[PDB]
Design a protein around this nucleic acid. Sequence first.
DNA 1: TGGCCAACAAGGCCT
DNA 2: AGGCCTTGTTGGCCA
DNA 3: TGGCCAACAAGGCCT
DNA 4: AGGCCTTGTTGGCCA
Lengths: 269, 267, 269, 267
Amino acid sequence: MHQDYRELSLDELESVEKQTLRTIVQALQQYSKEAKSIFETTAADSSGEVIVLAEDITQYALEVAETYPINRRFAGFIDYKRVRWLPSPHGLLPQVLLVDAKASTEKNRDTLQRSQLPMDAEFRNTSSGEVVTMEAGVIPHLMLQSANDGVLPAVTTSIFVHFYYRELKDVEGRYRELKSIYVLSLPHARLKQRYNPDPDTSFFGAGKHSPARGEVARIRVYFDRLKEACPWRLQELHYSADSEYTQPRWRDLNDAGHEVTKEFLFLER
Amino acid sequence: MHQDYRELSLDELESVEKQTLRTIVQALQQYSKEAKSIFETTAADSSGEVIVLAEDITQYALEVAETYPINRRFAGFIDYKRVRWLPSPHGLLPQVLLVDAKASTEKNRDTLQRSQLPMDAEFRNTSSGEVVTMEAGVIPHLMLQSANDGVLPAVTTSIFVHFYYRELKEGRYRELKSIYVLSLPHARLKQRYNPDPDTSFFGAGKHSPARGEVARIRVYFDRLKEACPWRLQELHYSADSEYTQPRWRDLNDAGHEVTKEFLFLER
Amino acid sequence: MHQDYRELSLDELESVEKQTLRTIVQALQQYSKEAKSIFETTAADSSGEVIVLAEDITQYALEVAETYPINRRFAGFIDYKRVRWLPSPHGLLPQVLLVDAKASTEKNRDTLQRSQLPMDAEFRNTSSGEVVTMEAGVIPHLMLQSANDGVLPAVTTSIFVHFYYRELKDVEGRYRELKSIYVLSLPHARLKQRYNPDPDTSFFGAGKHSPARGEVARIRVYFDRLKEACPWRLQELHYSADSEYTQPRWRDLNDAGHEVTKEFLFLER
Amino acid sequence: MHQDYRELSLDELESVEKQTLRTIVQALQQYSKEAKSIFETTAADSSGEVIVLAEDITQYALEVAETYPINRRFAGFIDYKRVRWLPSPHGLLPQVLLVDAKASTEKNRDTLQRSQLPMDAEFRNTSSGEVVTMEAGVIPHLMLQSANDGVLPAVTTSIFVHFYYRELKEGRYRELKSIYVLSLPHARLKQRYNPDPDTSFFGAGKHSPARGEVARIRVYFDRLKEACPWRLQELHYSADSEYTQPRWRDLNDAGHEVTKEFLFLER
DNA sequence: TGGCCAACAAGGCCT
DNA sequence: AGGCCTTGTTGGCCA
DNA sequence: TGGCCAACAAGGCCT
DNA sequence: AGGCCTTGTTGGCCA
Ligand SMILES: [Ca+2]
Ligand SMILES: [Ca+2]
Ligand SMILES: [Ca+2]
Ligand SMILES: [Ca+2]
């Protein structure tokens, strides 16, 4: 087995992102009943609330499903972060889990700051027909100081929890409606050749910034294009009138390379 | 992916025990410096103190390296136990980690109560020449109640932490030579590890049949390692450092047994 | 406020033992449903089981109600132990929580090893009319190394959880019966003058050892004599057919010095 | 003993806030060395970085000093929040700890959104000479559902952690001068701390009425301390040590204000 | 002190 | 899909 | 290796 | 209340 993620093959690397994602989906799933309650019944006190509700929900859902902590912390704009050891058959991997919460009325695409972009991006602006570029803002790994040698890189794993909702706002004891919780796993920089080799091959899109107003410049990631490149990298926990919790559905891909969905069991916790 | 370990192939099931063992070895390695202090400098109370030393060290070292806890406890004759989810490429697997501690002046073998036995054992007694048998005492899995359906089996994973020390009588009361860590295979793997009385790492118990004592069993380090090198690990102490030597035993991509040194953190 | 428990007055010292005990009673209370289940439905596999069931129940019940941990650990025969900071109005007190689990078919008295005795004991053997003595085996405190000075004593607080049960043994899916869970708070050594000034003033009794057989010698603590000396130092969580959990009853003493009992609310947890 | 904080006298209620504050000061004190490193050496991303630095430091320092957790969360506009039981001589009190972080180049005062305001405020504007008013945004308690009866109110306890720093431009990007810690009284204590517009530690907000901005409020350190010395604490950094100076402000048995140094651990 | 703005997220909408 | 412009959060600043 | 005992808890019972 | 004696746990030891 390995300790240095760089010695892992690309396939094995995607594998650890997959199990990282899977773990997080169970957390959100098992926390979905309380999440809907919190997301919908919390007083708005004049807009802005959803951004903070999304972050808190995510944190409460995930902090409960963490692993073997590493005594290392850092401050930054990323909502939820933890340096930890991730057990796996590839080896006990040091890891910096990074997940960002988003609240949106749109059930497709997500906006990213350059500080959240895992790998260098490039695509063609459908309107300007030109090639757009953006360097990754998330480091490939955080160096940890071993007690018997030199540094040991803790792999960075990027995740996005996207709360798709609708504003109903104040009515009875419910100020909004949580419709679905999408979870995204963005491929590590080492996987660029596989997911973004050329501007016409990618899941990126035009940023939500206003270039006319001379704004900082961001980037977008489109759900459908991510799911096509790799089905499991896009998960969806949807709410319906059949249950207080979301529908426990996990999207994966056969060993035969076809897309598949299955329902999984979850506990009350 | 899977949630039911029974759906996994035997090779995959072994990978979960192996990764469970690797996590534990890091924990004890990183806790080795303190383990040494507690084991060697803690005054003896009524002798047989190494017993509690071994159990306590094991808990402090491991309670710090757990994973996604499940709201269900396991009570019984096993030093350390936690029900939890184990992230894995084969799926997020529900698991019951069972680790038992042993203090011993011996460097080989280990003794087990039937309640710590993972699989139905069978071996040939060396002096009696007869076949000895023992039914497993550890359940293959603990059934958990899902919120949306029937039961979900949480795989049981057996691990043993063995403290090899020698009495000594400096401000120390004894010497911890090394900490061995054993991963015993699940019942599903019986045909791979103990298919018949002449192929097994088991051996006669430490009980006294003459005195009519219950009946216990043993696991021999050499045979366990020979059956699968990664299932027997060792963290040895040398005057080189205050921590054990960070060594992990495994095998090549060519099947060759290799012991590699690994990096560890202060804690 | 204080950091050194020795600077606390006797009254304040008893007060911290009281809040330590109170916290523990809630834990056991809220864990009583699962405790009964575990205690009664766990296969016996030939005797001895109850001693281990009592310890595990206690641990699961209490580890969940701990406070501000201190980075200090020690090995010893005491079942449950934790060095921690105990917030209180007297000050943020460093503390070594010590609790011992017992399983018994008797609903009165408890046996103690000298290693569990909090203060020096002395009483008169009702049969030999002689005076019995036993030095305390639990240290008054554990010295902790501060980072900006010398040592800081972490007060020792002794607690006993006594599982009063009856052997039914194997029948349907129940091997025994948990009747009540008693929780005892033994006064710190500093309180000797108050609880054991003379051999005819104490809650101690003849040990469970056999002097004829030349056994090591132990000591007993009698419930009724402890409750009389101080009502709150003896609590009782009893099970009845009215609820799966024990009856949430807390015993205390008025400011007027009279004994009182009240029922308290508890959560599912 | 009590479970309902409303049954407590005002002096007792203050003792719970005070002990809550003392625990937090130790946490930040023991985390001060690392806080200094994170605050001063973390590269600035788009400026306004001290904001996240202050929030994150506060969480790492405090998430390590919690008590008996209650299975109920609080979501909203408050940096750090945990519902829990607080051991106390007045009883095991259910509590909702609410602590908000602030980064600032100023050493006095603090700004608060209405949602972080613990009691209905009222003061006299110094330039307008008129009376300003603001209803509390923080609930007095969060009702919890008991397993055997009705509701149980979990007291809300307001704390603010203020990072006093100055821009600087060595391998450092700025300097953390000190960390102030504030304990704002519960609504029940209004008559003691803000009975009328001329007796209060509140002051005009930082919002812009001209621009028609919502309306915020301020708390002034000097008036808070003068009203009750222990409610304003300070952990200052000096070139003496890498940790802040472990000082706790309180008052005699004679009512005299005394600042004592206290012992702290490595962590 | 008060209180006007500056700097930034985070997104809602509307082509 | 693009991207313009609205809102709300947090304190730096300065009369 | 086998396997006989030693050293100790932890308590059940029986006056 | 006392306290004798039963059981079960854990490994030290040695043929
Ligand atoms: Ca975000
Ligand atoms: Ca053991
Ligand atoms: Ca015990
Ligand atoms: Ca804040």
